[PDB]
Amino acid sequence: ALWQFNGMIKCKIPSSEPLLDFNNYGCYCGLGGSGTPVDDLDRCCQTHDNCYKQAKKLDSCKVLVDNPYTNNYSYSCSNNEITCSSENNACEAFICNCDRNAAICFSKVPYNKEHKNLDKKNC
Ligand SMILES: [Ca+2]
Numbered sequence: 001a002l003w004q005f006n007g008m009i010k011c012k013i014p015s016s017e018p019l020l021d022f023n024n025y026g027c028y029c030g031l032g033g034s035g036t037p038v039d040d041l042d043r044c045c046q047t048h049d050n051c052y053k054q055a056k057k058l059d060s061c062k063v064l065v066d067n068p069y070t071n072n073y074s075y076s077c078s079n080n081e082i083t084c085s086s087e088n089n090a091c092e093a094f095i096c097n098c099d100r101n102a103a104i105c106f107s108k109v110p111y112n113k114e115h116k117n118l119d120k121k122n123c
Contacts, residue, residue: 005099011077012107026115027123035123038115044105051098061091071095
């Protein structure tokens with residue numbers, strides 16, 4: 001869910017306030033996501049969005065009637081490293097990995113402030 005994802009970003013980028021810094025960036029970071037990503041950070045978000053669509057196709061998630069946005073997987077942060085819990089079931093594990101990969105991606109790419117709060121007409 002959102003509370004764990006925001007926690008993961010903070011684990012990798014301890015200087016960030018993710019809800020302020022990563023929401024509404026580019027074409028993908030934020031509600032929706034369409035068009036060509038404007039930069040590598042936006043591609044991180046595009047991959048993440050595609051990860052959630054994929055999770056929705058997993059038999060495990062469908063039979064659990066899961067929502068990736070509300071998924072209650074467990075994770076831990078120590079020394080700025082994220083671990084997804086071994087106790088997670090197949091679907092929760094898939095969502096945790098989507099979130100983990102994105103948080104790492106975010107931490108490895110430049111941030112172009114000119115792409116924050118883009119007009120969607122550029123997407
Ligand atoms: Ca999105």
